[PDB]
Symmetry: C5
Subunit: 230 residues, 5 copies
């Protein structure tokens, strides 16, 4: 329980936990300052930070206890949050004429991706590469859908601020999420051990997680503010 | 109390606890995002997830402590929630002209069913089969009421979206709940030696619980959203 | 702190604690769906469940710790709640032309009753019968006031649903509360034995408490709903 | 950690903690039931109970642990709350037009009083009587200000219910607070040991505290209710 | 874990924690009594106190445990809060025609300052002076920006109460914050050991922190108050 000055992992847990708790409060308490239709999109963003805050709190204690943060445990959060973020694609293009078919697709993809991930990392480590492959494919499909699929066409039709915030999402998916597949390579045996192996990811996980989720949130909030002021 | 990767029960407690906590927040915070008439129906759906979240949190810790989740302890939650879900039949058809008699019936049935269950499982295990039988009968009665009784006739009279959402609820009762009677068979000795597959009932309980209750919620919420936008 | 199936006291603490927490949420979150005048009556009903929920949580832990629930400790809750329920008489007859004098009387009576009770049970057990007697007298006074006193006359003058809900309250006072004086008889030495074998007082306390308080709540809520819809 | 029936200090901590938590909820949840300008006055009353509830909870645990409640520790609460109560003078006479000069004065006086108190009781007990003297002077100043100073003149100018509630506050300051100076006399050596010495105030502290702060609250709330109905 | 009367650090943690928790409640609960536009500025001020309250709670326990408060641990809070205060410049000049470029600048500067601080104090103590220097420069830049830079000119252009509140903030930055750089000097070896060395700042940190943050809050709140009374 004693703190050390050089414990940079410790620090990043405490910061992340605190920043997620603050963000969660910030979206929950901002909900009320918006027009009827936007609220739900904010609300869900809050949820996302909220689940993370509560899980981070747990992890923050665990690391202080045992000085080890097992990667699979993160999945507890990811399997819940990653889908919600996908749902956030529906809420942005709902005004543009998005169909529940898209919703279902996204959720399906996101869940499969995270379950396959979890199987690769926890359940079946011998055959982890294949699970990786499946998850990879589900990721690519999601990234292709959002970049060149129906979602982009709907966004371009809508145009304006709605388009912009879409793109930034896609960047966050493309660049922000990329760190997670990489960490898998460093986590599981296979043909990618040489390229990525032995890297300390905890700090990168703690910073990235907070950035990713708070980032999404701040985008959707930016979209709401730019839509009310004009 | 360090966690292990292969502890799939552990994982499902943490996920279920987090998903129930999120849903509870989601309905509590969405309650205000509808007109006054729907609110109570949402509110109660939230309550359902809320009671589950708080109980799951307790169970989640217990399993982490002693690595055993006694089945009777689940009843703490079920005796409270199963009635509320039944109440949810009344709240949908209240605008269609439902009578409190129906509500009282449902509550009565649901309570008896769960108490009989609890007697079968906790106090009197030798004569568990009879209690089973009584609970069974209470189940059947409720399924007959909702499928062919006055509830569906009132829904059809109202007609449209109110009907649709009703049916899906009946499916959730019919198919969703079916896992609970089965687990009883696997729990008590008698004329049923029902043990099916290598799957651990705890895991099925943790996933099912969350599905069932989050399911309910999503349906009621879907009904409210499709009724307000038009 | 492992639970047993046969620990029926345990079970009733966990259920009671959970049901009180749910009810407290249910009144707090329903408060806002009413006209300005009703709110306070609901709010206070919630407060009542709220104090109980928080105390029950403490008792629930204690019993899990030491497997003994000292009766005097319940008073911590009762001395706070029993007065509020009395206030609930004032809040429903306030529109009928109740005077604050009545409210003060009620509070006074209820406090004296509970303090005398606490003196009987905690400070001097040798003199417990006399304290009993005094508490008894305060009970009778309250029951006579509400059944045949000014409160009934004001309710009958008002008439309608406001009257009805009054009666049911009086039943809850008359029948619901009766279990508490009985338990005293079983708790303290004197001229009364009140064996009441078989049933465990704790269990009757846990179920009764929840019934009494949730009951009150449901009544006041029923009154508000039946008065607002017309 | 085991409870005793004869532990009247224990009891009063648990009651006080619970009653403060209830009141805090009661003002927070009632805040919305008033016109905009009363809200702040309620809010602050709640804050007062809230800080007390949280400190009482801490003290309640401590006493259960070590069976001793050091008087200086209470100051943690008093230094925060006593100023807020003073602010409550400003918020009631905002109708008739009080000047921030009065606000600042009150806060200044109250803080000095409490700091001098803390110095008398914590750092230098040899020099305690002088600190007493200084605190005394700050008290007297406050009591004379509110009884015969500008505050009374403003209240009389305003007249009506606003005046009434003022007086009762002055009584609470005059009579309610008087127990605190006395306790000092019983706590520290000096020239007042003879008059007041060896007295145990814990029980009197626990009851008084709750009375004083819940009292203020009930007054401000009474003022708001009597000002909206007319 | 028993506390002593002369433990002034202890006392200041408990007061700070309590005062921050109260303030956080006070802004969150006041938020709704304002027009749409001001809310966000209050909200964020509350967030600031909120993060501090939760971190102070942790620190408060730590000191009670180990009787030592490591300086680097404070950074957990500062790295989150110091930026938000800077953002508070944007929210007050937003209606005056502030550009997000200014907000980004401020955040950038504040983050750099705090990171450089953290590097100086945690990871690289040998080269702490250079990090100091860099942080210093980031501070100076911020102070010159707010005193003579774009921010001041924008505030003067939109004079009145918005200007006043600006100045006071600058004072709080100039004078309030100054104690943090000083503490660095007392913490790290270099050319400033002679001037500042061996000083105990814990008590000064705890009082300053609460003043600084509650101060900010009270200013923004004051600005909102004198903006509604037209
Ligand atoms: C897990 C696994 C796999 C999966 C692999 C995956 C999913 C690989 C993914 C690779 C990725 C995502 C590569 C990313 C490349 C580049 C990145 C991350 C960043 C580029 C640019 C940056 C950082 C910033 C760009 C800009 C910003 C900041 C915004 C501006 O608007 C535009 C610009 C200046 C360009 C298989 C399927 C291949 C095999 C299996 O056995 C193992
Ligand atoms: C899954 C699904 C479908 C279903 C399709 C089909 C073809 C389903 C066909 C049949 C199914 C799923 C039947 C499941 C039945 C389960 C039941 C009726 C379980 C009842 C258990 C009871 C009443 C146990 C009672 C007892 C107990 C607990 C202990 C006693 O000692 C003994 C006894 C009285 C037997 C679609 C395709 C239609 C729609 C889609 O949305 C959902
Ligand atoms: C109150 C009042 C007044 C009087 C005010 C007085 C007497 C004083 C006011 C302010 C004072 C004394 C402020 C002092 C501020 C000190 C600061 C901001 C110090 C900053 C230090 C830094 C940034 C150090 C950085 C470094 C570090 C940390 C390590 C590196 O290695 C070296 C260095 C770069 C120097 C008037 C007369 C002006 C106006 C009247 O209206 C009111
Ligand atoms: C008569 C009737 C019916 C049929 C039956 C009903 C409703 C019966 C219900 C009876 C019940 C629930 C009676 C319960 C009574 C409990 C009482 C009066 C308990 C009082 C206890 C006290 C006051 C104890 C005090 C003392 C204590 C605690 C210690 C002291 O040392 C001694 C003493 C003063 C006695 C219906 C339902 C058909 C219609 C209805 O309108 C009327
Ligand atoms: C009959 C009647 C009533 C009842 C009571 C009446 C009229 C009076 C009651 C007086 C009471 C209850 C209290 C009097 C209080 C005296 C106080 C507050 C004394 C304060 C003393 C201080 C502050 C001492 C400080 C010092 C310290 C701390 C130690 C130093 O070394 C020396 C010193 C400076 C003296 C009412 C209230 C119902 C109203 C009306 O109906 C008339
Ligand atoms: C807030 C939580 C976030 C954004 C987490 C994201 C995680 C991923 C997108 C994971 C992707 C994976 C693959 C595509 C390949 C390897 C396994 C996974 C599950 C890490
Ligand atoms: C979240 C809680 C839920 C949905 C629990 C559902 C539980 C049941 C519907 C239990 C039913 C039972 C029978 C119909 C027969 C055997 C005994 C029971 C209690 C398991
Ligand atoms: C929420 C809990 C409730 C309603 C408890 C109520 C308890 C009473 C009305 C107790 C009355 C007593 C007497 C009339 C005689 C003996 C002492 C008491 C306090 C048990
Ligand atoms: C709930 C907290 C309350 C109402 C505390 C009030 C305390 C006082 C007004 C204390 C006054 C004192 C003096 C005038 C002299 C001796 C020292 C003090 C601080 C106890
Ligand atoms: C909530 C606490 C606050 C406002 C703290 C702010 C502290 C700073 C602005 C101090 C920064 C420092 C320097 C300019 C020089 C030395 C290193 C720092 C980070 C302590
Ligand atoms: C550290 C986590 C929380 C960070 C929250 C950032 C503060 C929000 C800044 C922009 C707010 C714009 C308000 C728009 C409505 C007028
Ligand atoms: C462990 C470090 C936590 C880092 C917390 C700060 C997160 C801030 C995220 C903001 C980045 C995206 C901004 C969106 C652009 C409008
Ligand atoms: C939308 C959220 C979905 C969350 C799905 C959680 C799945 C967890 C699976 C746990 C292990 C399954 C059995 C392992 C092999 C016996
Ligand atoms: C332990 C694993 C728990 C996983 C729970 C995931 C949340 C369930 C989502 C709801 C599923 C039914 C959808 C009904 C559509 C109206
Ligand atoms: C006003 C229209 C709102 C439509 C929203 C539909 C999607 C909502 C999904 C969020 C529910 C998440 C449940 C908790 C996590 C398992
Ligand atoms: C909404 C109704 C909930 C009712 C909960 C059940 C309470 C009774 C449980 C059984 C108590 C122990 C009985 C022991 C008999 C010897
Ligand atoms: C606007 C009026 C709506 C009335 C709806 C009927 C009320 C039924 C709610 C039942 C709540 C049960 C709470 C149980 C707590 C354990
Ligand atoms: C272990 C105790 C479980 C008790 C659960 C009680 C649930 C609420 C009961 C409500 C009583 C009926 C009130 C009807 C008012 C119109
Ligand atoms: C309306 C609320 C009234 C609350 C009454 C609280 C009861 C206080 C009991 C105090 C008993 C102290 C021990 C006995 C004397 C040594
Ligand atoms: C609009 C009419 C309001 C009437 C309020 C009567 C008193 C309110 C209940 C008691 C206050 C809370 C007590 C908390 C426990 C000490
Ligand atoms: C430890 C015992 C504490 C008991 C707390 C009871 C609540 C105090 C209420 C005081 C009422 C003052 C009069 C209000 C007039 C508007
Ligand atoms: C709309 C009028 C508002 C007037 C506000 C007057 C001052 C309120 C002071 C509140 C201080 C509480 C926070 C600090 C205590 C920890
Ligand atoms: C550990 C010591 C805590 C001290 C609590 C400080 C309370 C707030 C005082 C700051 C005053 C700022 C005035 C702002 C004017 C609008
Ligand atoms: C404009 C889009 C930028 C998104 C970049 C995300 C970077 C996340 C960093 C994760 C590892 C620290
Ligand atoms: C400490 C990190 C704060 C980051 C704030 C981002 C603000 C950008 C969105 C603004 C919407 C108006
Ligand atoms: C439309 C069908 C809804 C019910 C689905 C069945 C859910 C059963 C529980 C799952 C256990 C893994
Ligand atoms: C318009 C309301 C429909 C809500 C459907 C939500 C589907 C479930 C989401 C599960 C996410 C893990
Ligand atoms: C209509 C009146 C009903 C009153 C019910 C009170 C009895 C239940 C509580 C005690 C059970 C042990
Ligand atoms: C408007 C409906 C009147 C209130 C009756 C509610 C009864 C619910 C009892 C729930 C027990 C689980
Ligand atoms: C007219 C108002 C009188 C208020 C008196 C309050 C006295 C509180 C004493 C509590 C200490 C045990
Ligand atoms: C309109 C009535 C306002 C409140 C009056 C004071 C209430 C006193 C309660 C005493 C403790 C329960
Ligand atoms: C507004 C309230 C301020 C309270 C400040 C208390 C300071 C106590 C210092 C004790 C250490 C010597
Ligand atoms: C109007 C000028 C306000 C300046 C505030 C200074 C606060 C100093 C805090 C540090 C005390 C240890």
């Amino acid at each position: 329980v004693r703190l050390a000055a050089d414990d940079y992992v410790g620090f990043t847990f405490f910061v992340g936990c605190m920043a997620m708790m603050a963000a969660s409060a910030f979206f929950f308490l901002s909900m009320s300052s918006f027009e009827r239709k936007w609220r739900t999109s904010i609300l869900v963003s809050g949820l996302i930070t909220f689940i993370a805050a509560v899980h981070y709190w747990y992890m923050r204690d665990y690391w202080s206890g045992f000085a080890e943060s097992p990667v699979f445990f993160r999945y507890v959060d990811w399997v819940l949050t990653v889908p919600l973020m996908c749902v956030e694609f529906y809420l942005i293009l709902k005004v543009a004429g998005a169909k529940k078919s898209l919703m279902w697709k996204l959720i399906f993809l996101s869940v499969v991706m995270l379950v396959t991930g979890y199987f690769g990392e926890a359940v079946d480590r011998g055959n982890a590469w294949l699970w990786g492959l499946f998850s990879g494919v589900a990721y690519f499909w999601i990234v292709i859908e959002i970049w060149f699929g129906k979602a982009k066409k709907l966004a371009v039709a809508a145009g304006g601020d709605v388009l912009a915030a879409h793109k930034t999402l896609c960047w966050f998916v493309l660049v922000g999420w990329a760190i997670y597949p990489i960490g898998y390579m460093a986590g599981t045996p296979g043909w990618y051990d040489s390229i990525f192996g032995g890297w300390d990811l905890n700090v990168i996980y703690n910073i990235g997680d907070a950035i990713n989720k708070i980032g999404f949130g701040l985008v959707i909030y930016n979209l709401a503010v730019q839509a009310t002021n004009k």
